[PDB]
Amino acid sequence: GRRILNDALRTIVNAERRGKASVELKPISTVMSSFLRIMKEKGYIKNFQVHDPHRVGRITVDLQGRVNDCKALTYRQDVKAKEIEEYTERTLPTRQWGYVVVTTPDGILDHEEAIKRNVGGQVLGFFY
Amino acid sequence: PTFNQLIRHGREEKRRTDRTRALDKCPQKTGVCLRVSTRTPKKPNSALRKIAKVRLSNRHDIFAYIPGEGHNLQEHSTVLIRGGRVKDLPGVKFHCIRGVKDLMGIPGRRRGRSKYGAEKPKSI
Amino acid sequence: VVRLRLSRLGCKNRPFFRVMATDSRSPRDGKHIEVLGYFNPLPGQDGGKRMGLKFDRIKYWLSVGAQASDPVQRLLFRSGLLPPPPMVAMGRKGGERDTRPVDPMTGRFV
Amino acid sequence: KPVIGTVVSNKMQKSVVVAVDRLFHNKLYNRYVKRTSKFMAHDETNACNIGDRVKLDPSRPLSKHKNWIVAEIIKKARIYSPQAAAAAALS
RNA sequence: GUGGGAAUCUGCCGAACAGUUCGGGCUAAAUCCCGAAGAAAGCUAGAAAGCGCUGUUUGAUGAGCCUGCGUAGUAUUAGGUAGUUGGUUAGGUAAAGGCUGACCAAGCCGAUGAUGCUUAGCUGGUCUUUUCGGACGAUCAGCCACACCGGGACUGAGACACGGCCCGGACUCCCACGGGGGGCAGCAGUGGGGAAUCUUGGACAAUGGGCGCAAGCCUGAUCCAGCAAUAUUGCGUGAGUGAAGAAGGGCAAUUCCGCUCGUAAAGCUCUUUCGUCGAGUGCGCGAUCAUGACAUGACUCGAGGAAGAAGCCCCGGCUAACUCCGUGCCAGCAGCCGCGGUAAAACGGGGGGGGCAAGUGUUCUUCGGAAUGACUAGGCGUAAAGGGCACGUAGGCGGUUCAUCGGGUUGAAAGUGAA
Ligand SMILES: [K+]
Ligand SMILES: [K+]
Ligand SMILES: [K+]
Ligand SMILES: [K+]
Ligand SMILES: [K+]
Ligand SMILES: [K+]
Ligand SMILES: [Mg+2]
Ligand SMILES: [Mg+2]
Ligand SMILES: [Mg+2]
Ligand SMILES: [Mg+2]
Ligand SMILES: [Mg+2]
Ligand SMILES: [Mg+2]
Ligand SMILES: [Mg+2]
Ligand SMILES: [Mg+2]
Ligand SMILES: [Mg+2]
Ligand SMILES: [Mg+2]
Ligand SMILES: [Mg+2]
Ligand SMILES: [Mg+2]
Ligand SMILES: [Mg+2]
Ligand SMILES: [Mg+2]
Ligand SMILES: [Mg+2]
Ligand SMILES: [Mg+2]
Ligand SMILES: [Mg+2]
Ligand SMILES: [Mg+2]
Ligand SMILES: [Mg+2]
Ligand SMILES: [Mg+2]
Ligand SMILES: [Mg+2]
Ligand SMILES: [Mg+2]
Ligand SMILES: [Mg+2]
Ligand SMILES: [Mg+2]
Ligand SMILES: [Mg+2]
Ligand SMILES: [Mg+2]
Ligand SMILES: [Mg+2]
Ligand SMILES: [Mg+2]
Ligand SMILES: [Mg+2]
Ligand SMILES: [Mg+2]
Ligand SMILES: [Mg+2]
Ligand SMILES: [Mg+2]
Numbered sequence: 001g002r003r004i005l006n007d008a009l010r011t012i013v014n015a016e017r018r019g020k021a022s023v024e025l026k027p028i029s030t031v032m033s034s035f036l037r038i039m040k041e042k043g044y045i046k047n048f049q050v051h052d053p054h055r056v057g058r059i060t061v062d063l064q065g066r067v068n069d070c071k072a073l074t075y076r077q078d079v080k081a082k083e084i085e086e087y088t089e090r091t092l093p094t095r096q097w098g099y100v101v102v103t104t105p106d107g108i109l110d111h112e113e114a115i116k117r118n119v120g121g122q123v124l125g126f127f128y
Numbered sequence: 129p130t131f132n133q134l135i136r137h138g139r140e141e142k143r144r145t146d147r148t149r150a151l152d153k154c155p156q157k158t159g160v161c162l163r164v165s166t167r168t169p170k171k172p173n174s175a176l177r178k179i180a181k182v183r184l185s186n187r188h189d190i191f192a193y194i195p196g197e198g199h200n201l202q203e204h205s206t207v208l209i210r211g212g213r214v215k216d217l218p219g220v221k222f223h224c225i226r227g228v229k230d231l232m233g234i235p236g237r238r239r240g241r242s243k244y245g246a247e248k249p250k251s252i
Numbered sequence: 253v254v255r256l257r258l259s260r261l262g263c264k265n266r267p268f269f270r271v272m273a274t275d276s277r278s279p280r281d282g283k284h285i286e287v288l289g290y291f292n293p294l295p296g297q298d299g300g301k302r303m304g305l306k307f308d309r310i311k312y313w314l315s316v317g318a319q320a321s322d323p324v325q326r327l328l329f330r331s332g333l334l335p336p337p338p339m340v341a342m343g344r345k346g347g348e349r350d351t352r353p354v355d356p357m358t359g360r361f362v
Numbered sequence: 363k364p365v366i367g368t369v370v371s372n373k374m375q376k377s378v379v380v381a382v383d384r385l386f387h388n389k390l391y392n393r394y395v396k397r398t399s400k401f402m403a404h405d406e407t408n409a410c411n412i413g414d415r416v417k418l419d420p421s422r423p424l425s426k427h428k429n430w431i432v433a434e435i436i437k438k439a440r441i442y443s444p445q446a447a448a449a450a451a452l453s
Numbered sequence: 454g455u456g457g458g459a460a461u462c463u464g465c466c467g468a469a470c471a472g473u474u475c476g477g478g479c480u481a482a483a484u485c486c487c488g489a490a491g492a493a494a495g496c497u498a499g500a501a502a503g504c505g506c507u508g509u510u511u512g513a514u515g516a517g518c519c520u521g522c523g524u525a526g527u528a529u530u531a532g533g534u535a536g537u538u539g540g541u542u543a544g545g546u547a548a549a550g551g552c553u554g555a556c557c558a559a560g561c562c563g564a565u566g567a568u569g570c571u572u573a574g575c576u577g578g579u580c581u582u583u584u585c586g587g588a589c590g591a592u593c594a595g596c597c598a599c600a601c602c603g604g605g606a607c608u609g610a611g612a613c614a615c616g617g618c619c620c621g622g623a624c625u626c627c628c629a630c631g632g633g634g635g636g637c638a639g640c641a642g643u644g645g646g647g648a649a650u651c652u653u654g655g656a657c658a659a660u661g662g663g664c665g666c667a668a669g670c671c672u673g674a675u676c677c678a679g680c681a682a683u684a685u686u687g688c689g690u691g692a693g694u695g696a697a698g699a700a701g702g703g704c705a706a707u708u709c710c711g712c713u714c715g716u717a718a719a720g721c722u723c724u725u726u727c728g729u730c731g732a733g734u735g736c737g738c739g740a741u742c743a744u745g746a747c748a749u750g751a752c753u754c755g756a757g758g759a760a761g762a763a764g765c766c767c768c769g770g771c772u773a774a775c776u777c778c779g780u781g782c783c784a785g786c787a788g789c790c791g792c793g794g795u796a797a798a799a800c801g802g803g804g805g806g807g808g809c810a811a812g813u814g815u816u817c818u819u820c821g822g823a824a825u826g827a828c829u830a831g832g833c834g835u836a837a838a839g840g841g842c843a844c845g846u847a848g849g850c851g852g853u854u855c856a857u858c859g860g861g862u863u864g865a866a867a868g869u870g871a872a
Contacts, residue, residue, distance in 0.1 A: 001852085002850095002851085003850085003851060003852085004852065004853095027852060027853065028853080029852085029853070029854095030853095030854085053853095053854085054853090054854055054855085055853090055854085056853085057853070057854095074850085075131075075392070075393065076394065076861095076862095077392070078861095078862065078863090079863095080863075080864095081863080081864075090584095090829080104863075105862090105863060105864085118864070119863065119864065120862080120863055120864085121862065121863065122862070129832095130849090131391050131392075131393050131828080132393070132848085132849055132850085134391055134828080135388055135391055135393060135395060135849095136848090136849095138826090139826040139827085140826060141587095141826065142825065142826070148816095148817085151648095151816090151817070153817065153818070154647090154648060154649095154816095154817065155648060155649090155815095155816050155817045155818090156648045156649095156816070156817085157647095157648070158647080158648070172782085173782075173791095173792090173793090174782050174783090174794095175782075175783075175784080175785070175793095176783085176784090177785090185646090185647075185648095195786095196785090197784070197785070197800095197801080208648075209648095210648090210815075210816045210817090211815095211816055211817070212788095212815080212816070214787085215787070215789095215791095216787090223815090223816090225815090225816090236801090236802085237801085237802095238801090238802070238803095239766095239767090239801085239802080240765095240766070240767080240814090242765070242766085242813090242814065242815090243766090243814075243815065248764090253465060253466040253513095253514080254466070254513065254514060255466090255661095257660080257661070258660060258661085259660080259661085259872095260659090260660055260661090260675090260676090264676090264677085265677090265739080265747090266739090267659075267660090267739065269660080270872090272872090274661095275514065275515070276465085276466090276514090276661095276662080277515085277662085278661095279594095279661080279662095279674085280660065280661045280662090280674075280675075281593085281594075281661095281872090282594070282595085282872090283594090283595070283871080283872090284871075284872075285514085285871095286871095287871090287872075293659085293738095293739060293740085294738075294739065295737095295738070295739095313513090314467095315467085315512095316466095316467065316512065316513050316514095317466055317467030317468085317512080317513065318466080318467090318513085319466060319467095321660090321661080323659090323660080323740090323741095326741085337742095339742055339743090340741095340742065341742085342742040342743085343742070344736085344741085344742065344743095345736085345741095345742070345743065347736080349736065350734065350735060350736090350737090352734085354737090354753095359737095359752065359753070360752095360753065360754090361753085363521095363860085364860070365521090366860085371560090371561090373539095373558095373559080373560065374538070374539045374540085374558090374559090374560065374561090375539060375540050375541095375557095375558065376539075376540065377538090377539055377540085379561085384522085385861080386522090386523090389828095390585080390586085390828060391828055392828065393849095395565090396565080396848085396849095397565065398565060399521090399522095400562090402538090402539090402561090420457095420458075420520080420521090421459095422458085422459060422460060422519075422549050422550085423460090423518090423519060423520090423549050423550050424549085424550075425538085425539070425540095425550070425551080426538080426539090426550070426551065427538080427539090427561085428539080428550095429519080429520070
């Protein structure tokens with residue numbers, strides 16, 4: 001999942017820098033759909049649509065020119081509920097703007113919601 | 129290197145040789161002079177520097193420089209040797225301490241005299 | 253034997269004591285089972301001395317049979333956890349005292 | 363806890379050697395390193411082959427090195443036999 | 454170091470339950486030893502229902518044993534092991550066990566580094582550093598090992614026992630010459646080595662320990678004094694005023710009291726912190742029922758006179774701070790670049806100035822600067838560095854959906870993380 005997740009995120013950033021309108025991602029995953037939902041809620045992409053999610057998936061994303069870099073971690077990284085803010089102050093390059101997206105028992109959340117819910121898990125990646 | 133490479137083989141340190149091995153991690157040593165002679169410097173500097181071949185208390189043969197103006201060192205003479213090389217003379221890596229053992233201080237030195245072992249003159 | 257005793261703290265000419273439960277063969281400042289409280293032997297600014305104790309823990313160690321030493325008996329009695337020592341029933345050694353009042357801020361006589 | 367291992371040796375009488383697996387957290391470089399410990403275990407009936415996954419239970423020292431008792435064989439190893447292979451080949 | 458386990462013991466201390474009966478032996482006796490029942494042991498009307506012992510249940514504290522995880526360098530060390538790995542049966546141990554006698558099988562450890570070699574006590578922690586790391590393990594505290602060098606066991610609840618025993622060896626001292634005696638890596642102290650590290654002190658007054666019913670007796674554990682600028686964000690070396698701009702020293706188209714040392718000094722007024730000297734109370738206080746080495750101390754009062762107390766390095770650039778005289782690639786300086794060959798801000802002296810300050814410079818060692826081994830945080834076309842090219846073992850990494858489970862993960866609670 002990490003290889004295809006980083007693959008799609010780097011496709012998104014590479015096509016953002018060319019000033020395009022839409023991107024197509026294939027292969028896809030449910031983790032990738034939830035990550036894109038977090039990006040849409042934070043306002044870095046406008047819309048995304050998932051096509052044929054149970055046989056051969058493809059995702060179309062519409063861009064607007066707002067995201068600077070998206071990374072997905074290629075290794076295992078644990079985090080507890082009380083280490084989220086200290087980890088965020090060292091993961092983001094600017095230490096102010098950007099969100100760390102972790103996966104939890106309560107679902108795939110970002111780093112600000114998981115502090116409120118008091119639940120930790122595996123760090124998936126970040127976008128800023 | 130990749131993180132797997134750094135896990136399997138770590139990172140080493142830089143190679144650097146010791147300058148003053150004959151002191152053996154000690155500030156000063158006590159030695160007996162075997163010869164007292166002069167040497168010419170490396171060009172373009174031309175002089176006649178006073179050196180003394182000293183056998184230390186751990187049986188090492190070193191070359192020591194004699195500071196200041198004038199000296200009274202003889203052979204088989206006990207001197208105190210400290211680190212610090214001389215740039216003009218290649219192969220000379222030490223200094224003699226003025227004012228202790230038999231190497232006397234310099235009378236008449238007034239500026240920076242504690243480096244040469246002179247006592248403070250009397251104010252009259 | 254498990255004992256309740258005092259261990260020395262502070263510095264030279266400035267004592268302080270810690271009430272600790274130790275095994276009897278341990279050193280004075282060495283291994284201990286528990287720390288139970290503190291005691292200031294010097295008189296404070298209020299004209300009295302200071303003491304703090306862990307009441308439940310001292311109750312537990314006394315119930316399992318620890319033997320307090322000879323100043324700890326006095327301090328546990330004044331704290332009201334032990335009966336009085338036998339030699340306190342004797343009355344003080346009276347006599348004249350230098351009762352000239354002294355001004356507290358300057359140390360000279362008033 | 364629960365100790366589960368794979369049998370690597372069974373050529374002793376009433377004894378097996380079981381290899382257990384663990385992950386060591388290399389803190390400086392933030393990766394997980396697989397490490398192995400081989401354990402000698404007691405098995406009275408001599409039933410464990412090479413390649414099965416068994417579970418270990420702690421016990422008192424039974425020998426100089428034997429400190430574990432095999433409790434249950436989880437997954438049994440597969441053994442190829444040529445004569446029975448030809449017998450099932452004919453069918 | 455951290456967390457656990459079952460196959461054991463545990464004097465003194467707390468709490469129950471029952472006994473403490475009779476002979477003999479050691480010149481004389483016994484709570485010393487032997488025997489019988491069931492295990493023992495008696496003392497005291499001076500300590501008579503007060504001590505002590507024995508047996509059996511237990512708390513508490515210690516100790517033996519086992520174990521999961523973590524814990525140097527080296528591959529220019531690749532094989533090591535033979536009671537070695539397991540099994541049965543006996544013996545032994547308080548206690549599991551090749552701990553070992555006999556017999557049986559050929560196993561066990563190893564490329565996830567066995568074995569060989571070099572080095573080292575481990576931890577809490579100390580120094581340094583925008584977190585990480587690096588060097589260290591000195592004082593203090595926890596664990597371990599050792600007691601002139603090797604090997605043993607006895608007593609004992611507990612030792613294979615620093616100031617206990619036996620045997621061997623080296624050294625050393627006495628001897629009446631037959632032979633005995635000794636182990637400061639306990640506190641002082643002495644030779645030796647070294648660049649270098651302390652008094653052959655006082656007292657059990659406080660704390661802790663041993664014995665004792667107590668009274669009390671021991672304690673180089675400790676507490677307190679002595680030496681050493683070895684360290685620490687301490688304090689003081691005066692506060693004002695003073696122009697005859699004194700004398701003297703240095704420099705000068707030799708300008709402006711010619712410029713400066715310079716209100717600086719001398720002199721006059723004030724106050725005595727630290728130190729000096731002389732006295733007085735002391736259940737001030739460390740200690741209370743009483744017990745004070747420290748204590749010739751501390752506290753309070755009095756005498757006094759600015760009186761007793763400022764050096765070290767530097768002044769070409771890096772780097773704050775400039776002139777005269779002597780030398781002449783000589784003498785010499787130097788952390789780096791470098792200066793010195795007749796006008797040297799760089800050598801040595803006079804004067805003046807700058808930085809620290811009872812200190813200040815030189816040497817040794819550590820970290821930073823050093824992103825100069827780069828996890829945080831670097832690289833490999835031409836600068837150091839892509840294997841001549843592949844195939845593959847271990848390892849590392851690696852698509853999608855649905856369901857089950859709960860080892861990793863995660864939330865709460867409890868135990869633990871000594872000082
Ligand atoms: K090795
Ligand atoms: K510990
Ligand atoms: K020995
Ligand atoms: K005492
Ligand atoms: K000094
Ligand atoms: K003075
Ligand atoms: Mg064993
Ligand atoms: Mg050693
Ligand atoms: Mg740094
Ligand atoms: Mg270490
Ligand atoms: Mg020492
Ligand atoms: Mg004894
Ligand atoms: Mg015995
Ligand atoms: Mg002894
Ligand atoms: Mg001795
Ligand atoms: Mg000594
Ligand atoms: Mg000497
Ligand atoms: Mg006492
Ligand atoms: Mg007693
Ligand atoms: Mg100071
Ligand atoms: Mg005074
Ligand atoms: Mg006086
Ligand atoms: Mg008193
Ligand atoms: Mg004194
Ligand atoms: Mg300058
Ligand atoms: Mg000149
Ligand atoms: Mg200079
Ligand atoms: Mg000069
Ligand atoms: Mg570094
Ligand atoms: Mg890197
Ligand atoms: Mg580079
Ligand atoms: Mg490359
Ligand atoms: Mg090539
Ligand atoms: Mg090449
Ligand atoms: Mg699922
Ligand atoms: Mg789970
Ligand atoms: Mg907790
Ligand atoms: Mg602590």
